[PDB]
């Protein structure tokens, strides 16, 4: 579960990086 | 076993609220890809 | 004047102006998702 969030939280990190 | 039982119910219940979430963002994200064609 | 008729247009106005619109509501609909998900935080 941990996982799974921090990967969510890293390409939600990556996204406004795109915008 | 009582209290591991509810105790595994607790975190089971958690992962499936945040797995229905990111599954219907998903499923909107496609909807849109496929609508913008 | 056949040099100059070489350029790269094609279609007719109309369809230029179709073509640019359809364009635009393209990359406003895909900033407003993108926007949408930079936003929304399905975890906490």
Do not use: W
Request: with cysteine; hydrophobic share 35%.
């Amino acid at each position: 579960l941990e996982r799974v969030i921090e990967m969510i939280q890293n390409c939600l990190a990556s996204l406004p990086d795109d915008l | 076993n009582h209290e591991a039982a509810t105790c595994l119910e607790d975190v089971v219940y958690r992962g499936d609220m945040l797995l229905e979430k990111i599954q219907s963002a998903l499923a909107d994200i496609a909807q849109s890809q496929l609508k913008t064609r | 004047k056949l040099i100059s008729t070489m350029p790269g247009i094609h279609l007719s106005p109309e369809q230029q102006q179709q073509q640019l619109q359809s364009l635009r509501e393209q990359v406003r609909t895909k900033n407003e998702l993108l926007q949408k998900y930079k936003s929304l935080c399905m975890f906490e």
